[model samples]
Target: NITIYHNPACGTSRNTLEMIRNSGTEPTIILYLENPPSRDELVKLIADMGISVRALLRKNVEPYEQLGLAEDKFTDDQLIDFMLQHPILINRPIVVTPLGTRLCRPSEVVLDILQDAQKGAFTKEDGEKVVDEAGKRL
Candidate 1:
């Protein structure tokens, strides 16, 4: 089974979802904004991905600056609390597969941990070719 913490508002997340489908797996899409994970679940996901809680935080969103996330005063737990309070602070799309868990930023990064090979070609919304006709990663 595959799971992706998704945000439909984000193009990168949308691209990642499409790539997963291209690999022939209908992944479970969690719209985290609508249904935020529990604190422990969030912590476990961050641990599984091997990334710091701060690293998984989204910096560009208004909440980051408004909430003073750039300051060094907040502990990981505190940051997690803030993220729980403002789900938009969590950077996406985090993907989980049998191979590994990853923060699929560029979307193509999902290719690394995908269980199945890509079926065909794929082009991003920005018109970049990622997979070639023969299912080769380009």
Candidate 2:
């Protein structure tokens, strides 16, 4: 099973979900906004994704700037606490599958794990061709 955590209102999230569906496996979807992960879960996901505490943050939102997350002064524990208090601080889709867990940004990055998806020329939500007809990244 492939689990994707993204805001349903977000187009990039929707696109990745669509991309996963096109690959022929109906996936398990997690709308993180409504069903926020606990602090432990978030931390575990970050660990599983092999990313830094700071790397998981959305970073551009008001809380992030207001909280001064750019400084990297906060410890990993502090960042996790902050993220738990305000889940919006977290970034785009964090996906898990047999391919491994990943924090899929740019949306196109979702393709990295979905290699077996339908092999054909297809456009990303950004309106550019990503996968080739032969099922390879372009």
Candidate 3:
């Protein structure tokens, strides 16, 4: 089974979900803002993704600035705690599948971990071509 921590309001998240569908898989979408993962789950996710806790933080969000996350004073555990306290602080869309776990930033990044072939062409909301007719990435 494939799972994606998705923010529906985010264009990048939406595009990532679309790409997953285009690959012929209906992934389990977790609306993280409404229902976030547990701390243990988050720690495991970060470990599986091979990224530091700081790398997983979404610095553009209000909490990032309010919490002074840009400062190097915080430790990895502290950052992880902040992410647990504020789900929006967590960057998305994080995808988990048989292949691997990843933060699908550009949406098309999901293509790298997907095992299924894309059904057809895939275009982003902004008119960028991703996968071509033959299901090959452009």
Per-model CA lDDT versus the true structure: 0.92, 0.81, 0.92
TM-score for all predictions?
Answer: 0.95, 0.89, 0.97
In model 1, the runs with Cα more than 4 Å from the true position are none
Q: For residues 1-138, write the lDDT of model 1, one tens digit per residue.
A: 999999998899999999999899999989999898899989888998898989999998889989888889899999999999999999999999998899898899999999889888999989999989888777
Estimate the Cα RMSD of every predicted model relative to the unseen true structure.
Answer: 1.1, 1.7, 0.8
| TM-score of candidate 3 to 2 decimals | 0.97
The candidate with the higher TM-score, 2 or 3, is: 3
lDDT of 2 by residue, 1-138 (tens): 888987887777777777788788888888787787887788789898898988888868888989988995999999889888888888878888788788877777777787476655767777877778877777
- When sorted by lDDT, best at the front, the candidate numbers are 3, 1, 2
Candidate 2 lands at a TM-score of 0.89
**Candidate 3 structure quality by residue, lDDT tens digits, 58-128:** 98789999988899999999988899999999999999999999999888988889999889999999999
> How displaced is residue 128 in candidate 3, in Å?
0.3
